[PDB]
Design a protein around this nucleic acid. Structure first.
Lengths: 85, 38, 247, 206, 205, 91, 67, 128, 62, 19
RNA sequence: GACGGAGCCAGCGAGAAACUCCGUCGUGCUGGGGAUUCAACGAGGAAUUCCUAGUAAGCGCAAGUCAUCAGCUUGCGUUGAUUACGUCCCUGCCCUUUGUACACACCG
């Protein structure tokens, strides 16, 4: 405040148990849950089961049903992800 | 008679081979005196 | 606007004096100009020539442009050095490069660092342009590797610090393009090559050009300022010139 | 009913010629052509051949090369004069183009009683080719109006230049006859010949 | 800082490398590019809304950038300064360009036509000048020095009429119809002008 | 640094930033007393704003743009002696 | 589907009007195929809307009652 | 003293100083009448302001221009700028500002270069 | 006879040959009917253009 | 002298100048 | 455009021209060319270099301030344009193919 008032062109005002009322809010009718994005609530992650591959696309892949050719490219697909990482 | 200043060098062949041997050695050792992000 | 420039120069001359005293006490890091922007912002370079340049000098400027990844060539038609430098500083350029010649033979190379210096002037010898090479082809413009050989004295480090900052930082590790500046008796041979990593060594190929540069003036200010105080100058009529070495 | 704004005859300590106050009545090129009656016959060339802002002399020092299309705002007469100076030896001298265009307009009036500036507009409109070809062989496609007017000026100037390059005819008279012939639409004008050939070639590769 | 008014959250924050003080701001109509100006740096910082990275810095002003605005339609940027000039920036497009227009005095405020064909600027001389963006020529000029009312301060030792403290408008804006300007400043007056013919409609205390 | 900040700060340093002190360095006024008269009479503007209070301290970025007011009779004298009074700029 | 989204709008923007009329016929053919439409309904909708926006003034010009 | 104003016009290195005072309509450039300025072909250029606003306003003033520096074209444009500027300044100082506004409006409507210096500060078109 | 058509939209990313711009134009005689055409010169929006043939449809010229 | 000419304050004002 | 008159406008730096007005000449290697009296040269092949605004180009003036330069180098001013300022179609050179990116939207 002090260095402000000396170097301010215009008027600068001086800056200023029991339960307390919150003077100011960040709206009342708004709900906290509605303020959170779907991604924030939940986002697809890695496989919980070791025999599954789930991508961020939301598709899970059981290794048993995967054919050999599909398994190969997926392994190579991961390697590219790991390589630059 | 005296000469005041250095003679400007002549880039002869045995000069050239010496410089390129130096250049190959640093690339062989990957010793580059280059700027890097900070 | 002129008042700001006048004040900044006084602060700058004070800073170098303080930096010079600190180094002398150490005698008993990167320079202040480049410390602020070292490795943060890539250099911005303009290459130009003297008025009514010969065709070869224009060609040589293009070659220097290709040498520097972030270089832009500007025609110097009727531009005045204050007008040139002021127009340059507004655009935010880091360095300015100006060339001279003699009957289509490049002669001198001067580098001035903005906003406030330093300015370094070089003299060229044994210049060999790539256009002299037939069927040479086009260059690679990747961020090249830099080689600095035989720079030992404090001035040599200063020449290194000036020159090093003209390039972009952080060349990728396996870049095939390398630029080398080898100091040999104050005569810096400038070479650049493209190399291939072979199973039993390294093979390099010249693409050109060749030229030898010698510093003869280094000044604490922009090239426009012929009033600026001199950091260092090359003495030629001194009795020890024929055997004295500086870099 | 009338309105008067001046109640006293005006006399200046420095004499001024009568033609100058007559010009104060209305702005006229070289104080000797009015732009009021000028209209562009072809709708397409409108908004690119600019004649609404009257000027005394071609010289304007207007800054028309900043934008891609400020050239359209330039008065057409300056465009002709500035195109006229060419071939290196004439570079640097627009004022010579100004004298040449003045003499050319005088010649146009002498040969043809119509307002010469209208003749220039007519010639430019007539000699702007409407389609031509592009190398692929060739394939025929059409032309933007700006590029039309640019060729119109260029071809007229080039025909005038080459015609009198080594001829007794001076630049003024060859330019004048080229403009007259182009305005008439006669094939005699070189620019109209080039227009016809280009459009014919486009038709062949249509 | 960027704020969502549906969910009331600061989803993004932008800052310069050296903590540059910002005094003016403008946002692209597409809501993808933001430009801010500073009173100490003289260069307009540009960030990407989606990424939050500094795209580049628009340099060229010899003075601090006083105010900024994007054309709502053409998306052209107009920048003003105490440099006594106005610069039109065509940031979008393969090629980059700057069109400087000189003005008689220091510029304080700038308003953009909703059509995006004209720009108005308020100068320290107390003038509202309107220019055609596509051609970059002046089209109208309005006086304001007489219209403004400024009261002598109790501490003033000089008369209000002789005073020069504030006869300029520090803020201006158009009417959405496009025929009026409301102007305000460090004074006791709000003046509403009628742009095509340069007269005062009404004045408010 | 902070240890410097302990001792570098001085009353003289703050007084150095006084607008009456500053333009004296800029040579607008012979003397500090001449300066405080001019500011009170209202001839000196910092940036786009007029200042009539001597005790104002100019921060560094505003240091460059401290100047006289356009319609100052003083400035009219400044351009007159050097013979560059341009009446269009009203100064 | 094979056309990349980044270039879809422009490909739909290059579309000639008389050709656009045929694209409407194609959408009709998709429509009798209920299952195929349901599989890829959203992508069809965006393309149709952009086209109608693209040539709205041309479509109103057409007076074919069958259309 | 006699009411008068002083102004300048700049074009490249050409600089014209125009001194305007109450008078009987006397234009002189470098001590010679405006009608004698050269080159003659560009003479109308310097007639341009005198002509646009009407010779009547000039009848009540005596006005003198001194030009130095630059070339003939730059000198002509310096003169025309200086005369426009001086007319406007004189009208404001000693005549109603309504006429001042009218003068500015007319001049800027025709060509803004009469009133503001047209300075081609070099700009690097190539970014960087 | 020659028709006049007002440029209504400049086409982008058309792969046209260098110096060639694809454009869409609305005929003046009938604001409805539209055609796509290939041009050389610098063109913009709101320009009018003269066509000998109103039947050919433009095709990418590579 | 050259430096004095460069970094001259255009705003500097003096009294004997009035003469 | 050549020639004869007239008219005139700069900025660098301390051991003017181009140009404008009026006249003559006249498509003839001529009143162009100026080498050694009156030559070659009448616009330049295959090819090839560069170039976007006070820019290309013309014009003169000044100083040789430790490298280089001696009718060559730098600097100063004067005169001052056409075309394009859009494209990845060809060529060449690069970047991406873990949103990672704090909301919405879009993507997958």
């Amino acid at each position: 405040y002090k260095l402000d008032v000396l170097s301010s062109v215009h008027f600068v005002p001086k800056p200023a148990e029991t339960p307390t009322i919150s003077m100011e809010d960040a709206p009342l009718y708004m709900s906290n849950a509605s303020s959170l994005a779907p991604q924030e609530i939940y986002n697809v992650g890695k496989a919980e089961k070791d025999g599954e591959i789930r991508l961020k696309n939301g598709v899970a892949m059981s290794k048993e049903e995967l054919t050999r050719e599909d398994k190969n490219r997926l392994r190579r697909a991961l390697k590219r992800k790991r390589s630059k990482a | 008679f005296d000469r005041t200043a250095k003679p400007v060098p002549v880039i002869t062949s045995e000069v050239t081979e010496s410089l390129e041997d130096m250049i190959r050695r640093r690339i062989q050792d990957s010793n580059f005196d280059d700027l890097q992000r900070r | 606007m002129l008042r700001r420039q006048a004040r900044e120069r006084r602060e700058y001359l004070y800073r170098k004096a303080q930096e010079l005293q600190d180094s002398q006490l150490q005698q008993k890091q990167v320079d202040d100009e480049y410390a602020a922007t070292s490795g943060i912002m890539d250099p911005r370079i303009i290459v130009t020539t003297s008025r009514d340049p010969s065709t070869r000098l224009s060609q040589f400027a293009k070659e220097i442009k290709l040498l520097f990844p972030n270089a832009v060539r500007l025609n110097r038609g009727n531009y005045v050095m204050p007008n040139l430098v002021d127009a340059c500083k507004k655009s935010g350029t880091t360095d300015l490069v100006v060339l001279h010649e003699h009957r289509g033979v490049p002669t001198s190379l001067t580098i001035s660092h903005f906003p406030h210096g330093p300015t370094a002037q070089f003299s060229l010898h044994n210049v060999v342009m790539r256009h002299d090479i037939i069927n040479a082809g086009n260059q690679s413009e990747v961020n090249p590797h830099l080689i600095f050989d035989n720079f030992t004295t404090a001035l040599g480090k200063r020449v290194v610090c000036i020159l090093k900052h003209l390039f972009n930082a952080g060349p990728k590790k396996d870049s095939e393009r390398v630029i080398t500046f080898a100091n040999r008796g104050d005569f810096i041979s400038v070479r650049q090559h493209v190399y291939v990593r072979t199973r039993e060594g390294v093979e390099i190929a010249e693409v050109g050009p060749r030229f030898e540069m010698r510093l003869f003036e280094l000044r604490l200010g922009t090239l426009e300022n012929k009033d600026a105080d001199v950091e260092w100058q090359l003495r030629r009529f001194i009795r020890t010139a024929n055997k004295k070495d500086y870099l | 009913f009338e309105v008067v704004e001046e109640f006293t005859p005006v006399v200046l300590a420095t004499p001024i010629p009568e033609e100058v106050q007559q010009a104060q009545t209305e702005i006229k090129l070289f104080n000797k052509w009015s732009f009021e009656e000028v209209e562009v016959k072809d709708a397409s060339l409108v908004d690119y051949v600019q004649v609404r802002q009257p000027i005394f002399v071609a010289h304007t020092a207007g800054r028309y090369a900043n934008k891609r299309f400020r050239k359209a705002q330039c008065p057409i007469i300056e465009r002709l004069t500035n195109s006229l100076m060419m071939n290196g030896r004439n570079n640097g001298k627009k004022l010579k183009a100004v004298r040449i265009i003045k003499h050319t307009l005088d010649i146009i009036n002498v040969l043809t009683d119509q307002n010469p500036i209208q003749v220039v507009v007519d010639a430019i409109t007539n000699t702007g080719p409407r389609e031509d070809t592009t190398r692929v062989r060739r394939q025929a496609v059409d032309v933007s109006p700006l590029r039309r007017v640019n060729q119109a000026i260029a071809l007229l100037t080039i025909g005038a230049r080459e015609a009198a390059f080594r001829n007794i005819k001076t630049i003024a008279e060859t330019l004048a006859e080229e403009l007259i012939n182009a305005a008439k639409g006669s094939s005699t004008s070189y620019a109209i010949k080039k227009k016809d050939e280009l459009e014919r070639v486009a038709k062949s590769n249509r | 800082r960027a704020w969502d008014l549906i969910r009331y959250r600061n989803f993004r924050t932008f800052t310069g490398t050296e903590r540059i003080q910002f005094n003016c701001l403008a946002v692209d109509p597409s809501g993808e590019v933001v430009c801010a100006g500073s009173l100490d740096n003289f260069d307009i910082h540009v960030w990407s809304v989606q990424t939050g990275q500094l795209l580049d810095a628009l340099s060229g002003h010899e003075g601090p950038v006083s105010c900024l605005s994007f054309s709502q339609e053409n998306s052209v940027l107009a920048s003003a300064s105490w440099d006594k000039t106005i610069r039109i920036w065509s940031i979008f497009g393969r090629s980059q360009q700057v069109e400087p227009i000189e003005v008689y005095s220091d510029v304080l405020a700038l308003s953009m036509r909703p059509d995006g064909k004209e720009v108005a600027v308020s100068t320290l001389k107390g003038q509202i000048s309107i220019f055609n963006i596509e051609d970059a020529k002046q089209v109208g000029n309005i006086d304001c020095r007489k219209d403004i009312i400024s009261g002598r301060f109790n501490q003033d030792r000089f008369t209000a009429k002789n005073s020069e403290r504030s006869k300029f408008f520090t803020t201006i804006h158009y009417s959405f119809d496009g025929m009026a300007i409301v102007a305000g400043g460090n004074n006791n007056s709000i003046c509403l002008y009628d742009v095509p013919n340069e007269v005062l409609l009404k004045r408010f205390i | 640094k902070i240890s410097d900040l302990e001792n570098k700060v001085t009353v003289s340093a703050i007084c150095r930033r006084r607008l009456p002190v500053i333009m004296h360095r800029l040579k607008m006024a012979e003397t500090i007393q001449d300066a405080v008269k001019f500011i009170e009479q209202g001839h000196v503007r910092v940036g786009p704003n007029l200042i009539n209070d001597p005790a104002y301290l100019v921060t560094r970025n505003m240091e460059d743009y401290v100047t006289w007011v356009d319609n100052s009779k003083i400035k009219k004298t400044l351009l007159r002696y050097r013979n560059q009074i341009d009446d269009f700029d009203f100064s | 589907l094979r056309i990349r989204m980044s270039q879809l709008e422009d490909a739909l923007m290059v579309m000639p009007f008389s050709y656009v009329l045929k694209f409407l016929k194609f959408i009709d053919t998709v429509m009798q195929n209920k299952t195929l439409l349901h599989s890829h309904l959203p992508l069809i909708c965006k393309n149709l809307f952009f086209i109608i926006k693209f040539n709205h003034k041309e479509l109103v010009s057409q007076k074919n009652e069958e259309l | 003293a006699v009411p008068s104003v002083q102004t300048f016009g700049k074009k490249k290195s050409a600089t014209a100083v125009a001194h305007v005072k109450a008078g009987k309509g006397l234009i002189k450039v470098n001590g010679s009448p405006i009608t004698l300025v050269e080159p003659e072909i560009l003479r109308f250029k310097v007639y341009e302001p005198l002509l646009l606003v009407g010779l009547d306003k000039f009848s009540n003033i005596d006005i003198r221009v001194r030009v130095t520096g630059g070339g003939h074209v730059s000198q002509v444009y310096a003169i025309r700028q200086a005369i426009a500027k001086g007319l406007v300044a004189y009208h404001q100082k000693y005549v109603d500002e309504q006429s001042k506004n009218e003068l500015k409006k007319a001049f800027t409507s025709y060509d803004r270069t009469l009133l503001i210096a047209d300075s081609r500060r070099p700009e690097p078109k190539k970014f960087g | 006879p020659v028709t006049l058509a007002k440029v209504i939209k400049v086409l982008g990313r058309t792969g046209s040959r260098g110096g060639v711009t694809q454009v869409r134009v609305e005929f003046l005689e009938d604001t409805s009917r539209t055609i796509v055409r290939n041009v050389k010169g610098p063109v913009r929006e709101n320009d009018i253009l003269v066509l000998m043939e109103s039947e050919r449809e433009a095709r990418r010229l590579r | 002298l050259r430096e004095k000419a460069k970094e001259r304050n255009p705003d500097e004002y003096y009294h004997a100048m009035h003469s």
